[PDB]
Each structure stands twice: as structure tokens, then as C-alpha cells.
Ligand binder design. Structure first.
Ligand SMILES: O=C[C@H](O)[C@@H](O)[C@H](O)[C@H](O)COP(=O)(O)O
Ligand SMILES: O=C[C@H](O)[C@@H](O)[C@H](O)[C@H](O)COP(=O)(O)O
Ligand SMILES: N[C@@H](CCC(=O)O)C(=O)O
Lengths: 650, 659
């Protein structure tokens, strides 16, 4: 889901400049939800913009944002030339996880057939059914099945029973949130409060951008309780940008005000009051010269790996320092167990580093899927160190596992790629993988950056063990050489594309690996599932003989991973078993693995690295393969079907 | 792959009776798989059996045992009526490793063209290359491409180079095994030791059955190192011995067996059984196994039998352990260790395949009732990572066979680090049941089918019973324990209720008959049900079935759902019900039309879902047993519809080395 609104106060914008700003704001947020979209602006065709704020127009349509961009245009009733000196427009892209992604279920919702109050909502109201029966008995009719409509039909109920003729828009919103349960990030608009916007949040992101050629009256808005507002000093020119993400606002200004839970922001008379510089460059959210975000993010891994280690890894003296842990590493080493909790590819990053964490810490290491971790009420203890891997820092199950472990007194550590996220804030300490914004739905650099981050932690946990000095040096030299080796893998892009032309027509593919490459075959199978829609499955190589090997014949595509580590011989037995079953597999192996290369037709030869880093090099070909397969099948790699990025609700 | 030898000592048997006994023995060993079989016995047609001892006859053939039985009676020079007061016959089914299947590569392997020594072998001699070069340099010509022939040629080399004319058959074999490297189970026969047998093993099962109408000298054979120290009938000579690599070949003649251990050399000399080794001893123990337990009966396949007899195998697993009169649990196998176990700080379950799924299926209740960390590891990955293990860990090893290599090596790994080891096995005398500090035999009866059906559900019940032991002193858990135990009391009848829906499963099998993939989705107690169901359909049906954790759909796998991909969802009445419904709304929202396995009374889902398999409600931590059975049957029926032999093992090892 995504939220974006544009409030231009005494900065004249025509109706086309606003609609093109609402759509352009949703395009920056489309990667969070692309099942439907909508916009809410002022209607009417009066040359005097003042006589139009009493008419709200809603243009909602099913599909991505490009389906709404064309629905907004070529309309016969909306004159796009009216100049508005003061105007508020709200927009929203929706991730329809339930029901149909129809225009009636898309946002902004409405409170009646005349649009007196329209709201855009990100989250879930855990008591909308009770609010739907109370509002229906008073005389309100419902049109949609979404839980957002109960917020629109309720802000009007507080307006129809107010005590004074001029109850501020904040008071109406404050009474609403008091009746809403669960999480929500809202942005209201009403004809009765022209140009006024109200932004409240609870368990969901919501910031407010500001731009103005004049000086701002302060840089610390004081929270109020039922010399106070943020506004231009001498003049009135100001532009606000409500949004649930920082990408929809960086293009216009890098000055935002990250709200907090229960903070009811409100723009009145062009002044921002709360009741109760961004460190990002636009180039980071631009595809550049690549045709897709995913392809850029795969080919930027040489850089993102370097950024993850910047200011943390010194190769002249072989020292590792994660500043985020400087005030806890001592207490972390007196703990007795590591628990890694995450979902999806973040969980695979844990599987990919579990062995080296066990090796260098000598502690038990338990890697848990967040959803199952919660279902079982897993035992947690005060001397447990619990890591929570989340590219977004907002994943529902991972965040709930965090609060679960905090309640039991465990030491909590956040491995995130989003500063200010829930997981990064609520953990005792934090490590920011610093991989840059990830716009593609599939995690590519986030995986390898989480990988490297956990290896760097492992290197801190053994920096006082004489017997492990050489092992640490081996690994750090591998990290020094890792960016260049990633480039070597990317230079085989064309070779991967050719092998993809031999598989795009297949329905299934088994990816097999063990040891350090169990995670590789799991993550590779998830990528091929997510963007290619082929039935790809990861199979632990050691488990073939126990049943799954029966599925292999000359028709079943197979990809195997055979690297030069301590499992090489065992991986050769699995390969011999596959061949005996008439399998003709593609083997990802080391360049110097002459034996494997001679006896196998299709081989992807990757350069050798340290055994505990090879997983980074062996997964990249499967990222590229998934990409090429998706292209061959006519799919879009930046907008896979049936889901979006970051699972923040239930 | 299968060994069987029958030694009748002063128990008269005709040649026909001996050969019928050997053939019958191999028939109990076919269920594993094989490519060739053979027998070795005394030739010659002299009416006096004493003179026929210097003529060993061999009949080996590539094919099934039935073809061998036809070749036995199809011998024009052989008289089947000669009566032998003393005779040793050996038989073998082969699973070719070194050398292609053929008569020459079949066992018994001989030491020369006159059959002075013959040997049947299960396993692989790793150093068969070096040994072959040595014996060839001494003047021994080989005729087969098997590693086994080196054993036959080597024992003759020891005989030819013996120091005294009366060196014992044992001493020769001792010198042979001292040069062998690898795994083996061996039975020797020779004209120079008429009527004598020598059996030895290293890393491969070998047992000895005994029968006599006369009292035996002992039930504990003492080991002899290099009249009161061997096993024999006391007042008379008559006795029968049965060497075998699987008790299934012995149980119809006797239930008194001796399980040999690595490097034991058991010898029968003058009808007396001794056990040599370069007060320790081997016990004569009684097996509770019955011939009926390894027969199909009225069922058309072992897979069908073992699925439909699960009401009975569940009861056997609980027999003598769960008291439904005062609701108590007692696992006698743990009596001398339960106190140390409760002072430990972590449970680790280590297994492969379906045994591993049994750990996943009971992890939550073990966590709930023990309140200890519970870690469930795949044995192969457990070894690759060198997982940290400590002296206060309790490590469980789940293995129907008790011989799985990675699980066994995980056991030895954990023993080296001082952990308390517990075996959950279905095979008396197996490696894991022995080497563990204690065990809990699951008592499900033998599993003859290729896939694990009753073994899974009996392991499931066994770990629940252990969980109930670990909390029998907690006041706050008395209610929960009673609930679980009333569920176990009602479980056999609920399994029958599920088996009565077999017709509903067949209908689903015809709907998936033509399908290439199917996603099986579940969470919580039914995560394991997904993994186990998907493995069964992979193993038995050969279609791409995959178990997906329902909570992980939104993180990528949901992209496979459309109007074409078959989906099976498991939704039960437990604390994860609302979350399972949400996963169902996500699947449907993406044009998915899934089959839902749910509770009988879940009226909401039954109306909103077209096809639903409606299983009866049980305790939440027991539902996995009921909801997996429809998936067992589904795999079975799909296979039948597609013309597959469900009792045929398609999983073959690496190719045969031809050299
Ligand atoms: O390709 C991976 C997907 O993007 C998805 O599997 C993702 O990894 C999880 O949803 C966890 O995301 P977070 O790291 O933000 O928690
Ligand atoms: O369908 C299950 C198969 O029979 C297989 O998965 C089995 O579970 C193990 O591979 C063998 O291990 P154990 O003999 O130790 O159980
Ligand atoms: N390795 C021996 C015996 C194999 C077996 O049957 O266990 C052979 O190939 O003949």
C-alpha cells in the first residue's frame, strides 16, 4: 500500500500540475502495491478556485498506476486548466490481499454520495466489523467491503454530533482514532475544511514533507495536548507532501517530519501543527541506464557490498567494527545462544550464514521463520541474543517476533535496510546494511548485504581468539576481493541468458545444494517462483536419497551447486545419483573444477572464494537466471503478480 | 543385500527341504530390492550324506527369486531326496554394486573352480582393488567383477598358507577380515570344514536364529579372545541355526536370535555356536515379531496395508505406556535416564526424511510441555555445519530402520561431545538402538512398504508420549495432559473414521491424475503435514508436490497461485485458524480454487470451498496424524491410477561400476 498527497498553499498550480504530481507520487510508491490506485482532488470548473473546494472528485480504477494515469486524462468533464492557489489532493495505491481489486474497494474511500470526507488508509482496522454495525444503525449505508470505509463513515459521524459549530478537523480525527483498533496511517480531506489535511499514524509509517523558498519558523514542531506551527515566516508560499514513504518526497524536497504513534498532524492556514534533512539522493531511486530496477539492483551488488562494509572493515590491519554494536558487543558475548528471526529472503540470509556464525561464535544458532516462530510460542530466555533481519524493518511477523522476544528479556538486534523503521527503533541495537533503497519487489542486494552484515558480526565475535586469527584473515581477504569477483559473475550474464532459453518453457525446476549452498538453492528457488512463476523448489542435496530423488528423470530440469569446500565429495555423489536417474543438470561450480566441467554439458563457472562467502557468488547466477526466464516468458520483473514488496499487514 | 543360511545339525532334512527353506528365506528378503540371487549347498547324490560333504554345488541366476526356484527343481543331475543329518546351505539376494548383474557376478562367490570356499556378502569392500592385485600376484585368477570375489580368494590364501593342518575356520576368517576395508556381512562355507558356518560383520546387520526341542546351554554367549562358553543343546545334538541379515527371514522358524556386533566372528563347529573376538557376551533374546506382520494379507500392497492398519499400529505404540485408567504415561525405556533428561537444557531431534518430519510435527508440543529449547535438525546438514553440542543436550535420533548413515553418524557425533542420546527406532538390534544411551522402540511392527506410513504416525505418537512424561510433575499442565491423553484414547477410532473417507480421496486422485504439480499449504501443527504429504506424493506418485508454509505465501510463493496450479490447504480448528483463513482468502483472491482438508464441523469453509476433505476433530497437537492420512492415501491412489507399483523402490543408488 502507498499514500501520497500534495498540498500547495498559495503556490498556484493548475489542475494538470496537481494530478501529474499525485500520479508521479504514486509511481514512487507503486512498488508497495499495484493492484489498484486512485486520486482525490477538488472538482468543479469555476475560474475562481475558492468556489470549487466544496466539490470533491474521486478518480479510482483497477490495475497499476498507469491504468489510473490514463483514466485521469481524456476525461470530458474535468477542465485541467483551472489555477488553484490553495488545494489539497490525496492519492493511494492499494495492495488488494483480499477480495477483488475493484475501484469501489480502492482508496480514497468516502463517507457519503457527496464526498464530505475522503480518507486514504494504510493498514488494518481490527474492529471494523463492530464499527460497521454501529454506523449502519444510526443511518449510514456502506458500499464497499474494505475496512477503510468504516473510517470515512465514522469521521462524518463525529462531525454530525459535534458540540460546537467550529470543532477543528483535529478534534474530529482524534475522536475517530479513539474508536479504531489495530494499525493505520491516515490522510483526511473534507469539503468543510478546505485545504486542510490531517495525518495521524499508529503502527504504520507516515511523514510530512515541506518545501518553501522562504525561511521556516522552526526545526522542532512541539507536540500539543488537548511559536507552535511550521510555516514560512514572512510569506505564505509553502508546499506540503504527505506520504507513507520517503521516495515519493525526495524528488520535491528532502525536508520531512517523521511523525510518531498517535501524533495527529494537521495543516491549517498552510501551517503544520502536531497534536496528541533526508540522507538520500534521487539517483538512488532511479533505474539509470537499466530497463528494470531488478536488473540494476543485481548489477549494483559490487557497489552495495562495498557500502555495507564502508567504515566498518579495515583490510590493512584486518579489523571489523560495527558501530551499531559498540555499546552491546561485550554483553552479547556473555550470551549463550543466537536466534535469527526473519521472513522469506531475509530468512535465507540467516540460513546462508548459520554455519559460519556457529563456527566463529561457538554458540548455538537457531534460524526461525517469523510466522512459525510465533505460532509455536518458541521458548526464549534472557541470555538469548535475537537477530531480526528485515530489509524494510516493518514486516509484520518479524516485528511481532521482536516484541515477543523483548517481553522475555532477550537482547534484540536489528539488521535492517531502512533507518527509522519499527525494527530498527525497537531493538536494543541496530546494524544498517546500507545497501541503498530496494525498489524491485524481489530482494537481490538486500540478501547479499544481509549476508555480508552477518559475516562481519561473526568476525567481531572471534576477534579475541588466537586460534581463529588466520581464519579471520582468510575471510576478510575474501571480502576485499568479493566486489571484483561479483563483477566476474555478472560478466557471464549472456551465458546465463542462453541457458534460460532452454528452460523458459518448462513447468518445474529442482535446485539442489547443501552446506553453505542450502541457502543458495532455497533463495534461487524463491526468486524463480516470485518473478518467473515456474514451480522451482530447493532440495537439500543430502536429502535426495530419502525420497525426492524419485522426481528426477530425463524430463525434469535440475540445477545443482557443487563448490570446492568440505562437501565437494558429497555433492559429487548427489550429482552421480541425479545422472543415474537420467537427469541432465545445470551445475554451478568453480572455474578450476575441471572434473565437473568435463563430465557436465551445461556449467556455470564462478570464481572461487572463501567457503563461507561462496554463497554470495553462487546465488547471483540464479538471480540472473530468474530475470532472464521472466523476460522470456513475457513477464515484468519489477511487478510480479499476486503480491508486492514488504509484508506489513498480518 | 539379503543374506540367509540354514544349518541343520542332526535334524534330518532332505535336499528338497533344505532348498525350499533357502528359497523361502530369500522370499522374506525381496522387499528391499535386488537384481540376482543364488544358493550354495552340498552336491553329490550319494545316499550317505557323510560322503557328499566334499562337493559344493552353486545355483546362481540374474532375475527374481522365483526364477531361481524354477532353476533349482530344473536340475536333471540332482537328486532332491538325499537326506542330510548335517548340512549348511547359504542363500543371497544381490543389489549389484561392483560388476553388472549376471550369473557370474551373483553370490555365492567361490574361491576356485572346485568351490573349496564360498561366501555371500552384503556391503562393499573398499580396498578390493589392492587385495585383487595381491591375490593375482600370488597366482589366483578372478572370474567376476565383484569386490566379493576377493573375500573368497583371500580365505583360500589364508588356508593355503596356514601353519598347522588343524587351523580353525574362525582363525582363517579372522585373518581375512583383518585385511578387508569397508562394510560387510559375511557367511562362509567350505569343504574343508563340513557342516561348519562362520559369520562376521562390520557395519552391516547379521543375526543368528536358533531352534531346538532340547534345552540350550545358555542365553548369554560369552565372547572368546585369542564346553561352558558356547551355545548348544545340552543333552542331545539336534539343533537348527539360521544366519540372516534381516529378522524377517528367521521369525517363521524361531524368535530366539543373536545379534552380532562389529568384528564378531561367530562359528558353528560340531553344532555348537561360539563367538570369537581378537563378562562381555551376546544375548539370546526373544523377538516379538510375527510372520503375519510381514505379509500383505488381504491387501493388494504393503503400502495399502500399512496405511489402513494404522489404527492398530498406533495402539501398539501406546501399549504398556499410556494408562487410560488413571491417565499416566510410562516409557520403560527411559526409566534409568528420565531423571538426567529432565535436568538437561535443550532437546535436539536429528533425523532424515519422514523421520525428520516427525520431529517437526511434534516440536511445538515438546516446546510447550518441556519448556526447553527444541531444535529439529536434518542429519545431513547437522553434520555439514559441525553443529555445537554440549553435555547438557538431550539428542533424539529418529530412525525406523535404525541404520540410516547420516542419522547414525550424528549419533556418534553427539556422543563424542558428551550429550545424552536417545534412540527412537522401529528395529530391534539396529545400530541406533544399541549406541544410544537409551531408546523408545516405537513398536509399530515391521514396515515393509517403500514409503514411511505407520512409522511416521508411530514416531509422532512416541514423541508425544515423551512430552507427556516430561511434564507429569507440573500442576498447571494436568488439564492439558488429560486432554492430550483423551485424544490418544480416541485416536484409533478417529483414524478409522478418516480411512472410511477413502472414496473421497479417490475422487480427488482422479482430479489430480493429469496434474504435474500441486502446492500443499499449512502452518503450525500442520507445517509437517505439508512437508510429509508433499514428500509422499513425490516419492510414490512422481509429481512435483511441494509443501509451503502458509505464513510464507505473501513473501513470494503466492506468485504460483492461479486458476491452473492445484492447491491443497490444511485448515484445522486450533489457535491458527484465523491465520489459515487469511491464507485461504489470499489463494482465492488470485484465482486459486484449492482443496481444503478441514474439520468435519467447519461449516463456513465447507460451503465456500467446493471440494473439502472433512476429517474429524482431535486435540490440536494430534491433528497432524489425522490430516496426513488423506495425503498418504492420495499419493497411493494417484500412483495406482498411473499404473505404478507402489511397492517397487524406484530410488536406486549410483550407477554400477563396471571397471
Ligand atoms: O524476494 C524476497 C521478497 O522480497 C520477500 O521474500 C522478502 O524477503 C520478505 O518479505 C522479507 O522482507 P523484509 O526483509 O523487508 O522483512
Ligand atoms: O517416505 C519416507 C522414506 O521411507 C524416507 O524418507 C525415510 O523416512 C528415511 O529416508 C529413512 O530414515 P530412517 O530409516 O532412519 O527412518
Ligand atoms: N558389493 C557386492 C555386494 C553388494 C550387496 O548385495 O550388498 C556386489 O556388488 O556383488
Amino acid at each position: 500500500c502507498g499514500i501520497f498527497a500534495y498540498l500547495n498553499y498559495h503556490v498556484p498550480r493548475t489542475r494538470r500540475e496537481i494530478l501529474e504530481t499525485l500520479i508521479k507520487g504514486l509511481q514512487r510508491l507503486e512498488y508497495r502495491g499495484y493492484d489498484s490506485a486512485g486520486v482525490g482532488f477538488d472538482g468543479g470548473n469555476d475560474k475562481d478556485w475558492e468556489a470549487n473546494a466544496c466539490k470533491i472528485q474521486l478518480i479510482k480504477k483497477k490495475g497499476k498506476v498507469k491504468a489510473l494515469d490514463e483514466e485521469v486524462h481524456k476525461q470530458q468533464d474535468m477542465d485541467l486548466d483551472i489555477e488553484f492557489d490553495v488545494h489539497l489532493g490525496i492519492a493511494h495505491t492499494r495492495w488488494a490481499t483480499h477480495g477483488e481489486p475493484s475501484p469501489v474497494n480502492s482508496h480514497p474511500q468516502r463517507s457519503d454520495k457527496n464526498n464530505e470526507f475522503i480518507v486514504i488508509h494504510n493498514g488494518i482496522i481490527t474492529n471494523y466489523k463492530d464499527l460497521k454495525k454501529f454506523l449502519e444503525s444510526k443511518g449510514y449505508d456502506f458500499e464497499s467491503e474494505t475496512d477503510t470505509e468504516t473510517i470515512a463513515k465514522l469521521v462524518k459521524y463525529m462531525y454530525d454530533n459535534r458540540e460546537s459549530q467550529d470543532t477543528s478537523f483535529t478534534t474530529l480525527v482524534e475522536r475517530v482514532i479513539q474508536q479504531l483498533e489495530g494499525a493505520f496511517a491516515l490522510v483526511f480531506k473534507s469539503v468543510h475544511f478546505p485545504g486542510q489535511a490531517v495525518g495521524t499514524r499508529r503502527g504504520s509509517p507516515l511523514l510530512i514533507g515541506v518545501r518553501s523558498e522562504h525561511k521556516l519558523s522552526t526545526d522542532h514542531i512541539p507536540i500539543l495536548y488537548r511559536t507552535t506551527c511550521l510555516f514560512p515566516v514572512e510569506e505564505k508560499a509553502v508546499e506540503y507532501y504527505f506520504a507513507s514513504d520517503a521516495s515519493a518526497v525526495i524528488e520535491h524536497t528532502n525536508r520531512v517530519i517523521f511523525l510518531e504513534d498517535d501524533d495527529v498532524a494537521a495543516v491549517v492556514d498552510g501551517r503544520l501543527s502536531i497534536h496528541r534533512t533526508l540522507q538520500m539522493e534521487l539517483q538512488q531511486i532511479m533505474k539509470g541506464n537499466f530497463s528494470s530496477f531488478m536488473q540494476k539492483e543485481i548489477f549494483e551488488q559490487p557497489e552495495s557490498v562495498v557500502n555495507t562494509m564502508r567504515g566498518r572493515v579495515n583490510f590493512d590491519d584486518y579489523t571489523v567494527n560495527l558501530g551499531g554494536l559498540k555499546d552491546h558487543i561485550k554483553e552479547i558475548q556473555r550470551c549463550r545462544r543466537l536466534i535469527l528471526i526473519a521472513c522469506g529472503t531475509s530468512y535465507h540470509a540467516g540460513v546462508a550464514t548459520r554455519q559460519v556464525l556457529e563456527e566463529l561464535t561457538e554458540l548455538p544458532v537457531m534460524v526461525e521463520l517469523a510466522s512459525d516462530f510465533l505460532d509455536r510460542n518458541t521458548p526464549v530466555f534472557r541470555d538469548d541474543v535475537c537477530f531480526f533481519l528485515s530489509q524494510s524493518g516493518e514486516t509484520a511477523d518479524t516485528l511481532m517476533g521482536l516484541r515477543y522476544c523483548k517481553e522475555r528479556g532477550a537482547l534484540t538486534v536489528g539488521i535492517t535496510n531502512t533507518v527509522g523503521s519499527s525494527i530498527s527503533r525497537e531493538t536494543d541495537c541496530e546494524v544498517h546494511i546500507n545497501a541503498g533503497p530496494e525498489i524491485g519487489v524481489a530482494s537481490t542486494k538486500a540478501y547479499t548485504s544481509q549476508f555480508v552484515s552477518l559475516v562481519m558480526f561473526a568476525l567481531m565475535m572471534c576477534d579475541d581468539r588466537i586460534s581463529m586469527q588466520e581464519r579471520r584473515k582468510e575471510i576478510m581477504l575474501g571480502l576485499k576481493r568479493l566486489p571484483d569477483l561479483i563483477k566476474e559473475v555478472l560478466s557471464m550474464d549472456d551465458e546465463i541468458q542462453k541457458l534460460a532459453t532452454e528452460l523458459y518453457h518448462q513447468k518445474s525446476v529442482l535446485i539442489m545444494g547443501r552446506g553453505y549452498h542450502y541457502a543458495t538453492c532455497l533463495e534461487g528457488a524463491l526468486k524463480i517462483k516470485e518473478i518467473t512463476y515456474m514451480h522451482s523448489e530447493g532440495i537439500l542435496a543430502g536429502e535426495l536419497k530419502h525420497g525426492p530423488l524419485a522426481l528426477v528423470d530425463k524430463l525434469m530440469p535440475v540445477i545443482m551447486i557443487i563448490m570446492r569446500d568440505h562437501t565437494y565429495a558429497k555433492c559429487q555423489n548427489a550429482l552421480q545419483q541425479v545422472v543415474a536417474r537420467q537427469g541432465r543438470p545445470v551445475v554451478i561450480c568453480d572455474k578450476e573444477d575441471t572434473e565437473t566441467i568435463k563430465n557436465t554439458k551445461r556449467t556455470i563457472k564462478v570464481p572461487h572464494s572463501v567457503d563461507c562467502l561462496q554463497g554470495i557468488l553462487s546465488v547471483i547466477p540464479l538471480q540472473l537466471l530468474a530475470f532472464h526466464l521472466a523476460v522470456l516468458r513475457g513477464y515484468d520483473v519489477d511487478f510480479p503478480r499476486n503480491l508486492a514488496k514488504s509484508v506489513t499487514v498480518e
